C-alpha cells in the first residue's frame, strides 16, 4: 500500500572490527527493493524530533516509497564500541552503506541527508569509494573539522563551540551510559554549568584545565586543544583535500549566521565542478533557524522553509537515486536569502557571476577608535599617512555578539553592537550614509597593516549594517591569529614595531546596505569566547595563566602606502 510503512528498531550492523552498530529502518510498504537514505546521528537515533525540525519532514519520503535508515554513531546510545569524535566515522559509515547495499530491501542506491553532524558524516561517508552512495545533502556542515567548527581560518581556537559542544557530548555519553554511576548526578549539574554560562567556562585559566570535561571526553583535550597548529592530526580526519577528485551529487545548505558557513560554502565550490551540486543559505544561526531575532526580523518567509526544502531534497533524490532526469527541473543551482531587502533568490552559482571583489579602505580624520572616531570608509585610497592604536588587554577582550556563536548566546547573529561600540579598543570605519543601495553578496575579507608591540596577538575584523535608527547590525566577521598569519601549518612568531600586510577570512554574507544606511567594520584584537584570547606572549595559549599573559598595543596603519582596506563583493543589477 502506498504510503504506508513499518518501523523495526535497534537492528544492529555489524562494522568491519566486529562492533556492532544501531540501526532504525523506516521501510516502505514494497514489493521489489527501494532507493534507501541514511542518517548518521551521535545524539540518539530514537530522538527525531531533536534535528528533524532543522532539516526535513524526511517521513514523506518514507511515505514516497523510500527507505530511510537512522544509526547511533559508534559508543553512543544503542550503539556499542567506545565514542571518539570524528575519527571513526568514515569507516564506520563505509560499513553501513556496504551493509545497506547487500539488504534484500535496497536497490542499489543508497544517500544521505541531515544536519550539523549529520552533515559531516555525509562527507565521510562520500569520500568513501561506495559507489552505491549517489548522492548527500550535507546541512550546516564542514568537509574541514579544524576550519571549521573547532578552529578556523583564522588560526584562533573556537573555545565556546569547543566547551559547548564538549558539555552536550558529555550529557549524552552520560545518558548512555549501561549503568547509571553515583557522579552521574553531579556531572549533570556540572554540564549544565557551562552550558548557563560558556564565557564563563573559557575564562578559566590554563584553559587546557578541564576536569570535567577532559574526564568525560579526553578528546577535547589531547585532540583539539593540545593541536592548535593545523597539523597532521587534523589533516587525517579533513575530507576537503578529497572532495576535489569526487563526483557525488550534493545538496548544501547554510547559514549566515551559522558556526560552519565559511565550510559549507566552500565544499560547494569544491564540488560543483564535477556534479550537480545545490546551494541554499538562509540567515540562520545553529541554534535559531527561525528568521526571528532580538533585534533584527527577517520576516516570516525566513523561517527555515522546511517544507520547501523536503521538496527540494525528494526532487534531489529522485533525480539521483531514482534515475528521474528531469526532477529537478525549475530547481535553481543556488538560493539565497538576501539580507537587507530580506528576500530569497535564486542564482546560478556561488560565487555569482558578476561579483566585483571592491576594496573600500580605511581613513578618516583623527583617531578611529570607537563608534563616535573618525574612522571612514571610501572605495578611493586614503591620502593621508595615518594609523589608529589602541591597548588590548586579554583579561578584558572584546565580548562576541551575534556572528557565528554556536553555543554561547547563539541565537542571535545579526546582533546589535551598540553594547561594544564604544570601547577604545574597537576601531570603528564607517562609509557615509547611502543614498544608493550597495549589495554585498558573496566571501569578505580585510587586508589589514599592522604592528604590535608583542611577537604574537590577534586582529579581528567584523562587517556592520547601521541602520538609521542606530541599530549596528553584525554580518560576518573574522580573525587572524599573527603567528598563522602566512601559513596555520607551520606558525612564526612577529617582531614589535614591525608592520605587516595580513588577511583576515571574514566567511560571507549576502546583504543589500539601503539608502539610509552605512556600511561599517570594526576592528579590534579580540572576540571572546567566540574565539579565545591571545596571551600576546608567542607561548602555547590554552596553557598559559592570565597573570603571566601581556597586555600589547596594537596599531592598524593607513594610508597611500599602508592601504589597509576590506573587500567587498559588490553586486550591481
Given at each position: 500500500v502506498d504510503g504506508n510503512y513499518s518501523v523495526a528498531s535497534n537492528v544492529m550492523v555489524p562494522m568491519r572490527d566486529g562492533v556492532r552498530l544501531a540501526v532504525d529502518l523506516y521501510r516502505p510498504d514494497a514489493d521489489g527493493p527501494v532507493p534507501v537514505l541514511l542518517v548518521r546521528n551521535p545524539?540518539?537515533?530514537?530522538?527525531?524530533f531533536a534535528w528533524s525540525t532543522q532539516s526535513t519532514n524526511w517521513l514523506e519520503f518514507v511515505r514516497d516509497g523510500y527507505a530511510v535508515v537512522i544509526q547511533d554513531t559508534r559508543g553512543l546510545f544503542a550503539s556499542e564500541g567506545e565514542f571518539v569524535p570524528h575519527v571513526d566515522d568514515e569507516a564506520d559509515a563505509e560499513d553501513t552503506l556496504s551493509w545497506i547495499l547487500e539488504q534484500a530491501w535496497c536497490d542499489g542506491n543508497v544517500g544521505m541527508f541531515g544536519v550539523s553532524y549529520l552533515g559531516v558524516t555525509q562527507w565521510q561517508a562520500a569520500?568513501?569509494?561506495?559507489?552505491?552512495?549517489k548522492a548527500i545533502a550535507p546541512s550546516m556542515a564542514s568537509a574541514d573539522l579544524y576550519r571549521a567548527p573547532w578552529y578556523g581560518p583564522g588560526g584562533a581556537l573556537s573555545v565556546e563551540a569547543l566547551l559547548g559542544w564538549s558539555a552536550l557530548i558529555g550529557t549524552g555519553l552520560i545518558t548512555s551510559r549501561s549503568d547509571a554511576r553515583p557522579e552521574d548526578a553531579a556531572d549533570f549539574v556540572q554540564l549544565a554549568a557551562i552550558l548557563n554560562d560558556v564565557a564563563g567556562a573559557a575564562s578559566?585559566?590554563?584553559?587546557?584545565?578541564?576536569?570535567l570535561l577532559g574526564r568525560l571526553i579526553p578528546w577535547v583535550i589531547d585532540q583539539v586543544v593540545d593541536h592548535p597548529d593545523n597539523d597532521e592530526s587534523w589533516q587525517s580526519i579533513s575530507l576537503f583535500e578529497r572532495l576535489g577528485g569526487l563526483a557525488t551529487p550534493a545538496l548544501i545548505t547554510a547559514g549566515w549566521y551559522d558556526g560552519f558557513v565559511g565550510e559549507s560554502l566552500r565544499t560547494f565550490v569544491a564540488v560543483k565542478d564535477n556534479a550537480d551540486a545545490r546551494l541554499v543559505v538562509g540567515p540562520w544561526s545553529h541554534s535559531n533557524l527561525?528568521?526571528?531575532?532580538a533585534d533584527r526580523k527577517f520576516g516570516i518567509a525566513a523561517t527555515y522553509p522546511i517544507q520547501e526544502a523536503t521538496t527540494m531534497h525528494k526532487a534531489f533524490f529522485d533525480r539521483h537515486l531514482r534515475g528521474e532526469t528531469d526532477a529537478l527541473a525549475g530547481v535553481p543551482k543556488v538560493r539565497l536569502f538576501v539580507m537587507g531587502i530580506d528576500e530569497w533568490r535564486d542564482e546560478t552559482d556561488w560565487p555569482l557571476p558578476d561579483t566585483a571583489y571592491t576594496p573600500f579602505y580605511l581613513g578618516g580624520s583623527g583617531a578611529a577608535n570607537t563608534s563616535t572616531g573618525g574612522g571612514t570608509l571610501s572605495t578611493s585610497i586614503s591620502g593621508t599617512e595615518s594609523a589608529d592604536t589602541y591597548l588590548y588587554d586579554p583579561a578584558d577582550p572584546v565580548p562576541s555578539l551575534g556572528?557565528?556563536?554556536?553555543?554561547?548566546?547563539?541565537?542571535?547573529?545579526?546582533?546589535?553592537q551598540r553594547p561594544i561600540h564604544d570601547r577604545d579598543d574597537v576601531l570603528c570605519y564607517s562609509t557615509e550614509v547611502l543614498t544608493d543601495p550597495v549589495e554585498v553578496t558573496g566571501t569578505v575579507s580585510a587586508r589589514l597593516f599592522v604592528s604590535s608591540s608583542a611577537v604574537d596577538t590577534d586582529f579581528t575584523a567584523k562587517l556592520v549594517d547601521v541602520f538609521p535608527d542606530g541599530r549596528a547590525i553584525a554580518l560576518c566577521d573574522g580573525i587572524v591569529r599573527m603567528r598563522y598569519r602566512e601559513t596555520l601549518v607551520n606558525p612564526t612568531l612577529i617582531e614589535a614595531g614591525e608592520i605587516y600586510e595580513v588577511a583576515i577570512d571574514m566567511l560571507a554574507t549576502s546583504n543589500v546596505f539601503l539608502p539610509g544606511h552605512r556600511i561599517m567594520v570594526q576592528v579590534s584584537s579580540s572576540n571572546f569566547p567566540k574565539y579565545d584570547r591571545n596571551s600576546n606572549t608567542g607561548g602555547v595559549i590554552a596553557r598559559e595563566q592570565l597573570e603571566e599573559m601581556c597586555t600589547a598595543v596594537n596599531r592598524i596603519h593607513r594610508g597611500p602606502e599602508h592601504p589597509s582596506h576590506i573587500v567587498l563583493p559588490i553586486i550591481k543589477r
Amino acid at each position: 500500500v502506498d504510503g504506508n510503512y513499518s518501523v523495526a528498531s535497534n537492528v544492529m550492523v555489524p562494522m568491519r572490527d566486529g562492533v556492532r552498530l544501531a540501526v532504525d529502518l523506516y521501510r516502505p510498504d514494497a514489493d521489489g527493493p527501494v532507493p534507501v537514505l541514511l542518517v548518521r546521528n551521535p545524539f540518539d537515533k530514537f530522538d527525531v524530533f531533536a534535528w528533524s525540525t532543522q532539516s526535513t519532514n524526511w517521513l514523506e519520503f518514507v511515505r514516497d516509497g523510500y527507505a530511510v535508515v537512522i544509526q547511533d554513531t559508534r559508543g553512543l546510545f544503542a550503539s556499542e564500541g567506545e565514542f571518539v569524535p570524528h575519527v571513526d566515522d568514515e569507516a564506520d559509515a563505509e560499513d553501513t552503506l556496504s551493509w545497506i547495499l547487500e539488504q534484500a530491501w535496497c536497490d542499489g542506491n543508497v544517500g544521505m541527508f541531515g544536519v550539523s553532524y549529520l552533515g559531516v558524516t555525509q562527507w565521510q561517508a562520500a569520500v568513501s569509494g561506495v559507489g552505491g552512495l549517489k548522492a548527500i545533502a550535507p546541512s550546516m556542515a564542514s568537509a574541514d573539522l579544524y576550519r571549521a567548527p573547532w578552529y578556523g581560518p583564522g588560526g584562533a581556537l573556537s573555545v565556546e563551540a569547543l566547551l559547548g559542544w564538549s558539555a552536550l557530548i558529555g550529557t549524552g555519553l552520560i545518558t548512555s551510559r549501561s549503568d547509571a554511576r553515583p557522579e552521574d548526578a553531579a556531572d549533570f549539574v556540572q554540564l549544565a554549568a557551562i552550558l548557563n554560562d560558556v564565557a564563563g567556562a573559557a575564562s578559566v585559566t590554563p584553559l587546557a584545565e578541564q576536569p570535567l570535561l577532559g574526564r568525560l571526553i579526553p578528546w577535547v583535550i589531547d585532540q583539539v586543544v593540545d593541536h592548535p597548529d593545523n597539523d597532521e592530526s587534523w589533516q587525517s580526519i579533513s575530507l576537503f583535500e578529497r572532495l576535489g577528485g569526487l563526483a557525488t551529487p550534493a545538496l548544501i545548505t547554510a547559514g549566515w549566521y551559522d558556526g560552519f558557513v565559511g565550510e559549507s560554502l566552500r565544499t560547494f565550490v569544491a564540488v560543483k565542478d564535477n556534479a550537480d551540486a545545490r546551494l541554499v543559505v538562509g540567515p540562520w544561526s545553529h541554534s535559531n533557524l527561525t528568521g526571528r531575532n532580538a533585534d533584527r526580523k527577517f520576516g516570516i518567509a525566513a523561517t527555515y522553509p522546511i517544507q520547501e526544502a523536503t521538496t527540494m531534497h525528494k526532487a534531489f533524490f529522485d533525480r539521483h537515486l531514482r534515475g528521474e532526469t528531469d526532477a529537478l527541473a525549475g530547481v535553481p543551482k543556488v538560493r539565497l536569502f538576501v539580507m537587507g531587502i530580506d528576500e530569497w533568490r535564486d542564482e546560478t552559482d556561488w560565487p555569482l557571476p558578476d561579483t566585483a571583489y571592491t576594496p573600500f579602505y580605511l581613513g578618516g580624520s583623527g583617531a578611529a577608535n570607537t563608534s563616535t572616531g573618525g574612522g571612514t570608509l571610501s572605495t578611493s585610497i586614503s591620502g593621508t599617512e595615518s594609523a589608529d592604536t589602541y591597548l588590548y588587554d586579554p583579561a578584558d577582550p572584546v565580548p562576541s555578539l551575534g556572528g557565528t556563536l554556536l553555543f554561547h548566546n547563539g541565537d542571535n547573529g545579526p546582533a546589535d553592537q551598540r553594547p561594544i561600540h564604544d570601547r577604545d579598543d574597537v576601531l570603528c570605519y564607517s562609509t557615509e550614509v547611502l543614498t544608493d543601495p550597495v549589495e554585498v553578496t558573496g566571501t569578505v575579507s580585510a587586508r589589514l597593516f599592522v604592528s604590535s608591540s608583542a611577537v604574537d596577538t590577534d586582529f579581528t575584523a567584523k562587517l556592520v549594517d547601521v541602520f538609521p535608527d542606530g541599530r549596528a547590525i553584525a554580518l560576518c566577521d573574522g580573525i587572524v591569529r599573527m603567528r598563522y598569519r602566512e601559513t596555520l601549518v607551520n606558525p612564526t612568531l612577529i617582531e614589535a614595531g614591525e608592520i605587516y600586510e595580513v588577511a583576515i577570512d571574514m566567511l560571507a554574507t549576502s546583504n543589500v546596505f539601503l539608502p539610509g544606511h552605512r556600511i561599517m567594520v570594526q576592528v579590534s584584537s579580540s572576540n571572546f569566547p567566540k574565539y579565545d584570547r591571545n596571551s600576546n606572549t608567542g607561548g602555547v595559549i590554552a596553557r598559559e595563566q592570565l597573570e603571566e599573559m601581556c597586555t600589547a598595543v596594537n596599531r592598524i596603519h593607513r594610508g597611500p602606502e599602508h592601504p589597509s582596506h576590506i573587500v567587498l563583493p559588490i553586486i550591481k543589477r
